[PDB]
Symmetry: C4
């Protein structure tokens, strides 16, 4: 039967490590796909780790150009959480260089975008097969979440973006029951930009903390109602959470407009807590090093910069990167509330390191109502490989 | 319980990519069987990719002579769609260098032909074991579909051919419930030739688009009724769909007789649409390069050459090859109609390339009611391998 | 629920190939256990291939001494029929250098013998764990079937031998419900010898065609009743079926006494057909080359040498070896009778070939009521390996 | 539904080999994790082998420093008993360099401790996800069982230790239903020390045979009641069972105080039998060589040194090491009593051997009411590896 996911998010004080896959380290000798954009989604029987292969394996000649971002070889697959993206445990999901996924209690729903950049198409899947499609509507990279979409009482919603990586673009929400689309919406956000949102269910509504790739060093936020009515803005916080980003002291929070002088970013996330918010980010303000998460007092509703809880999961001497959200189903956590969790992508090799390849590993952290000590659960691989 | 498969085929406007396995690319380092003749069949829980191994793996000394077509080592196996034909996820089906397969809602039914060429035998399997057999009846390669057979309301039917690859041969239809044969038929087609049919269910009857290897550059078509009464001919179309084949301008369609001056071919397919038809084919008229599919107006009932929908899934700079059909069960697509899909085999190495081996990869496309943009989702492997 | 297996054996006219694993060929590059003594047993959901690893893999330094027969490393494992004995699909059964196995409709029952030769012990397993044991009772290699034991209406019976490989030894039957022994019997056979029986169910009684390693070039036969009352002798046939063995022309059949001047043998099998019998054997009378099976008219009840059905599954230019029996459950074949099948072990490397290792592959043939043409489905490996 | 596990332990006369994994031997060529601290726990469907990887595989550069004990890479995983800890069959449990696990009839419960040593944290898991946590409470390695915890009628209990490896430390018991903690206890044991207990269910109470790392060459024992009331002491026996340990002749048993002049040890176990006890141990009193188990008459209640049953499972010419307990569920053994079993860890390479790596293999022995002959089922690997 169907999953409700209508409870608010639980109020945690810290996150405990769920898993760690050791994708890369294990790949020096194992048969592991070369990937990127990994994320985590859960059903009422298990959580799985979805990723985007490069139709190749680590420590092999085919892992060469693996930095480009797109190719016809990129395919969306998955494996039980914590397990590495190896070839022998992989479940084929779909053909994509940009995906998202979520389960609604009964079956999984996947969306893999692939094809030419001026005419890419999104193949929606449900129950082991594609059921519906969405063609690029602005002829210019029809991307998406690169993270767990969201299902509430049977209806699963997600976000998509067609446009430049810089200047203004076009966004849209998507709502669908059992793999068949059922209406969507065009996000009005002139001057504001949005990409790869790390959503999650909360209070019977969908909340996302996306990524402005145009001008914002602060992230845009967006609450989606079931009838497609929505709200869009930016984490109010007085602290920046993008990368690259200006300093905490030189940044002024903003609930409606983007801020900071930076035209590039990185996927990221944030959880709503009362009017408070837990916001993740890479410690090193310029590169993709280390990963830290912060709970600014009142941050979701005020421009607050009042900190009172900080914990590192990746120190600044370790490659980090992407990081999305998702929740544990009540049919697993057992809580009376949606336990919030997130993952951290730990990229390696190019661009940052001298290697002919690029890939990443992931680490899964999870709510809990106990303050967790700072530590580093970094990749570990010894670069370069048998290159 | 049993599957009906009595609904007509849905009327699509284009096909969206279901999966891609990256068999070869992944094999440069992985443990993947060396194969050929792959295809796709689906049950009410999943679609699987069936293939014919060579009892060996890529990038190994045993992948040597792998071009011959037949050996006692060739065995029919399968893996969830999109997954590569690796050794660790393979499901043993049967011993064969020529197979077909289909599920009837409850269990799978496989038929693997193997043995000497003048006395080969077909072992029929059902539920993990052989139940019935069919011995060669003309002492001369007892081949078959090399594609998904067809089950309607419990009875599964398929096609077989015993004879020369050229001059006239002997064909026969086959109908069977739960793995036990139950009557069959000899196809009368003097002057006309048939091999490896890419059938599918439609309107409570079975339709196949086979391959004349004798003289036809246009494919033969055949509608099988449940009582074994049938119809046999050639796609009426005024456009050739075999390889090698003469030009579109120099070809005259034919609903009853084969045409064109060519004594060799390749497996292929076609879907009925009203009186219209979607016909697949390799773009390059002589070699096994690129793959394109066309919807000629009225083509299934008239000698029409009226085009009004063309989409490439493999441009002409990429090795292609075989391509068969099959349908998605209503217990998966959810449609009220049999969603039509097909796969494309992408061969590599010998004969076309300087390698001691030969194998292929596959790509799965699927109905949908949206016109899909042209693209190439080609093999990708870097030949030669660690040869 | 429980399996009856009380129906007679079906009367076939030939056997069709079920599967072929390509263990060795695939091992040149794959991760396959180095094994020996493989066999086949089936439950009402699937047949599996049981074997004895050497706690090592092909094409590795540990596959060295792998000829000895016994070590503390030898462990009994299995994999779906036709699948190779690779490490990633293997199911651990038990610790042994001599096993047997069978399912009784509900769970599997395994018996792995291991330990010192003068005090070896048999660990009986049932449902994923050992339930009962049988200690060596004559301090001298406590071996067993090396083939599928037999279960009838819940009670599973098998055979064991403690003694020299030559001169007289001690045998015993074993009957047990759900993994717990329940009485057994000492076979009286002075002058007669018995080892590794290839039994099967028939007419509510158990029939085995074992191996005299002392003096018989003809095999001993033994019918086990449910109350442990039994019958013991030798295939009556006027044709020898052991290896080494004297010529067909110089052999005189014998229903009660062993015959021929040979003190060594090989595992083998035979099926009862009316008073007729299908008897398997290696074609080459001295070595372990080729495999043939024969249906001598009346052979099971008379000293007959009347042949009228012969089919080779391995020509005499191909290494062969062991071969045991077993039946397909009615809950799989669908027949109203126990379809008889058997497997053929194809050994390689030492002793016969110049290699530091020894192992084998298997081939599964199965009843059917159609006369099957002679062919060779031999190993295939290219020796030596990356040695 | 829930598991009772309230029956006493069965009274065996010997233990029969359940399985053997051949982890290391197989790893010379296979893809096996490099591990340590392996153990065995069982549910009412199967027993599984839990271990602690090093986020790497054997015969690879990453298996280097693998001796340290702790890293952020260490993750707790498992595989069906007897199966090696290979990457393709591994089930991710949690992130840890110190774990324990047990099933309560419905789902599994795992606890993985990881993080800094002065602030480590324990993530409790249940049903594929962490549900509750326990932070280090003495800032100094928050370790645990490294063996199967214990569940009785739904409530699962285990033991933890925070302190120095030498001088006095702090212990505590833990009781929890469905992954959520529910009260615990601080063990009062001044002068006495406890670590990595090898518990098991017996008489509706929990009994553990731990390891004093401070001063005891005799092991401490502890009976846990359901209301957390408990008893703590040392195996009464007049024979030492730790390593290093003084001689049997120079040792005087002790039911309340530790004895012997040794400040280091090794994990170990013991089973209660009447007032008798089966105690395991490494034969060689100083190193980690061989493994033997002894049943001293009355040993659990008296300082007895009365032996009358000894059996070796690893002779003193073979590396051995850790060894924990656990029981077979009645829903598997079928007995009316909790069949007692245990495993033996066979370490290899560093520190004892000249290798850049360290890891181990395991062997599983199991109750039974038959006296089992002495033998060696040692590792087998040929060191060094392709180093
Ligand atoms: C479709 C595509 O190529 N998406 C890109 C993404 C995108 O480039 C930016 O979001 C700007 O729009 O950037 C990044 C990135 O790491 O910055 C990875 C993505 N790679 C993949 N999703 N495969
Ligand atoms: C049984 C057999 O050898 N079949 C051949 C097939 C056949 O040769 C032609 O259809 C003419 O009859 O050709 C081809 C081919 O690629 O042209 C592949 C097949 N290989 C395999 N099915 N293994
Ligand atoms: C227990 C044992 O070592 N059994 C031997 C077996 C036996 O040697 C003869 O049957 C004489 O008794 O011979 C053979 C053989 O191939 O001749 C293989 C067996 N190897 C294994 N079962 N592992
Ligand atoms: C947490 C930790 O590092 N535990 C150590 C353990 C400990 O060191 C002693 O018990 C003293 O407290 O010793 C040993 C050991 O083999 O002596 C292995 C353990 N390694 C692992 N559990 N990973």
């Amino acid at each position: 039967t169907y999953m409700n996911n209508t409870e608010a998010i639980c109020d945690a004080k810290g996150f405990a490590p769920f898993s760690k896959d050791n994708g890369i380290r294990i790949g020096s000798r194992g048969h592991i796909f070369v990937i990127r954009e990994p994320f985590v989604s859960c059903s009422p029987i298990e959580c799985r780790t979805f990723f985007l292969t490069q139709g190749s394996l680590l420590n092999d000649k085919h892992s060469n150009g693996t930095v480009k971002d797109r190719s016809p070889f990129r395919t969306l697959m998955s494996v039980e959480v914590g397990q590495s993206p190896n070839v022998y445990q992989a479940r084929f999901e779909a053909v994509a260089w940009s995906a998202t996924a979520c389960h609604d209690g009964k079956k999984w729903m996947t969306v893999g975008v692939t094809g030419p950049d001026s005419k890419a198409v999104a193949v929606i899947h449900y129950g082991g097969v594609p059921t519906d499609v969405v063609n690029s509507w602005a002829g210019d990279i029809l991307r998406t979440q690169e993270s767990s979409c969201t299902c509430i009482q049977g209806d699963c919603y997600w976000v998509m973006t067609d446009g430049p990586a810089n200047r203004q673009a076009q966004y849209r929400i998507y709502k669908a029951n059992q793999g068949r689309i059922i209406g969507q919406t065009d996000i009005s956000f002139n001057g504001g930009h949005i990409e790869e949102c790390s959503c999650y269910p909360n209070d019977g509504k969908v909340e996302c903390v996306c990524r402005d790739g145009w001008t914002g060093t602060n992230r845009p936020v967006l609450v989606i109602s079931p009838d497609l009515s929505y709200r869009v803005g930016y984490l109010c916080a007085g602290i920046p959470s993008d990368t690259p980003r200006g300093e905490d002291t030189q940044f002024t929070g903003s609930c409606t407009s983007p801020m900071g002088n930076q035209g590039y970013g990185v996927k990221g996330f944030g959880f709503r807590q009362g009017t408070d918010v837990w916001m993740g980010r890479t410690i090193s303000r310029t590169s993709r090093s280390g990963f830290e998460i912060l709970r600014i007092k009142n941050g979701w509703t005020q421009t607050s910069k009042e900190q009172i809880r900080k914990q590192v999961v990746v120190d600044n001497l370790n490659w980090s990167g992407y990081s999305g959200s998702f929740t544990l189903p009540v049919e697993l956590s057992g809580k009376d509330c949606l336990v919030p969790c997130f993952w951290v992508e730990m990229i390696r090799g190019k661009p940052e390191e001298k290697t002919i390849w690029t890939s990443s590993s992931s680490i899964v952290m999870c709510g809990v109502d106990y303050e967790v000590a700072d530590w580093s659960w970094h990749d570990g691989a010894i670069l370069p490989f048998d290159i």
